């Protein structure tokens, strides 16, 4: 089971602090966190080369990430807002490889 | 001594488009701490691997610390020492290829001292004052605690920063409320030296190379040495 996210489906009120947990098993260096326009293309929020280090992606604004261990990465959202409402996907990438999570469907109301 | 820093001789937060979270990373309750152990291997003519295991998570079972040079390596090569340092991973190597992975391994610089007759009486801990200056004013002052009778500035520094993170937002995931800042030390004799706290003026931050400054394994005498931190608001 390559890459798994958690939770799969989430409905939260505008305000609350939401965290998205992603974890791997092929232990790839590179791990990524994604989001794409309602039925469009996937755009980079945040990525990571290795535990204890992230870099800003395309659309950094209004997210927090964290890599605490080679196989683990998380998307932090301090004060949510409906805007941030979408479908998130996690990947890991390495030695000619790229895996994806099953996506997290979120709702900011 | 090391002369007091200069204005344009200090790094500016405003100049780092990077992510200040990779710096927060190395001091929010992150250090390696081992007690009474002995080197157990080695890579280049100046790094001693120990078999220290991640207590917090499960990242490493070994810890490669790199020292200023080869003779400083031997000074400790087979002695029973303690450890206190900030570890990293991205670019933690043991061979020639520069970006390669391992596991149970982690790197650092400095942070070790001979265990024998360097701890206290009955587990008592020593306290070290820290005067904080915001825009030249003694705003906040606290203290730090250690078990060494003579400890690695690194140990002490980390502990300082960890508090400032936990109570005065010294570093935040996107940046920092401060423009500049440096941690200066004073030795009973009159030796005074300082270390910049802010990243290099540019786009990215090599975690490692920052830390390489701790490879002088420089030590200080707890019971006497005094600390000063100096900041300037954005």
UniProtKB/Swiss-Prot annotation, chain B:
What Gene Ontology cellular-component terms does the record carry? extracellular region
* Known function: Staphylococcal enterotoxin that activates the host immune system by binding as unprocessed molecules to major histocompatibility (MHC) complex class II and T-cell receptor (TCR) molecules. In turn, this ternary complex activates a large number of T-lymphocytes initiating a systemic release of pro-inflammatory cytokines. Also causes the intoxication staphylococcal food poisoning syndrome.
Taxonomy of origin reads: Bacteria, Bacillati, Bacillota, Bacilli, Bacillales
| Residues that hold Zn(2+) according to the record | 8, 82, 115, 119
Q: Entry's InterPro entries?
A: Enterotoxin, Staph/Strept_toxin_CS, Staph_tox_OB, SuperAg_toxin_C, Superantigen_bac, Toxin_b-grasp_Staph/Strep, Toxin_bac
Q: Which organism is it from?
A: Staphylococcus aureus
The protein's matches in SUPFAM superfamilies, at most eight in alphabetical order, are given as: Bacterial enterotoxins, Superantigen toxins, C-terminal domain
Please identify the protein, giving its name as recorded: Enterotoxin type C-3
Q: How does it assemble?
A: Interacts with MHC class II molecules composed of alpha/HLA-DRA and beta/HLA-DRB1 chains. Interacts with host T-cell receptor/TCR beta variable chain TRBV8-2.
Where is this protein localized, as stated in its record? Secreted
């Amino acid at each position: 089971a390559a890459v798994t996210q958690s939770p799969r489906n989430k409905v939260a009120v505008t305000g609350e602090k939401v965290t998205l947990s992603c974890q791997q098993t092929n232990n790839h260096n590179n791990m990524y966190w994604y989001r794409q326009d309602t039925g469009h293309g996937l755009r980079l929020i945040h990525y990571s080369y290795g535990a204890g280090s992230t870099e800003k992606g395309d659309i950094p604004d209004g997210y927090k990430a964290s890599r605490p261990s080679q196989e683990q990465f998380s998307l932090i959202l301090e004060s949510a807002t409906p805007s941030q409402t979408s479908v998130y996907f996690c990947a890991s990438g390495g030695g000619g490889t790229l895996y994806f999570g099953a996506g997290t469907r979120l709702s900011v109301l | 001594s090391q002369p007091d820093p200069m204005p344009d001789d200090l790094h500016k937060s405003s100049e780092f488009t990077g992510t200040m979270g990779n710096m927060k990373y190395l001091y929010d309750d992150h250090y390696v701490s081992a007690t009474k152990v002995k080197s157990v291997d080695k890579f280049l003519a100046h790094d001693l691997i120990y078999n220290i295991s991640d207590k917090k998570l499960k990242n490493y079972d070994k810890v490669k610390t790199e020292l200023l040079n080869e003779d400083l390596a031997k000074k400790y090569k087979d002695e029973v020492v303690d450890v206190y340092g900030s570890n990293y991973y991205v670019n933690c190597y043991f061979s020639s290829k520069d970006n390669v992975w391992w596991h149970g391994k982690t790197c650092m610089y400095g942070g070790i001292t001979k265990h024998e007759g360097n701890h206290f009486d009955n587990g008592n801990l020593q306290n070290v004052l820290v005067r904080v200056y915001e825009n030249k004013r003694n705003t906040i002052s606290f203290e730090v605690q250690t078990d060494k009778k003579s400890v690695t500035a690194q140990e002490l520094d980390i502990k300082a920063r960890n508090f400032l993170i936990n109570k005065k937002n010294l570093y935040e995931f996107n940046s920092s409320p401060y423009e500049t800042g440096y941690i200066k030390f004073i030795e009973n004799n009159g030796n005074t030296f300082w270390y910049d706290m802010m990243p290099a003026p540019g786009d990215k931050f090599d975690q490692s190379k920052y830390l390489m400054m701790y490879n002088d394994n420089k030590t200080v005498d707890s019971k006497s040495v005094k600390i000063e931190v100096h900041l300037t608001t954005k």
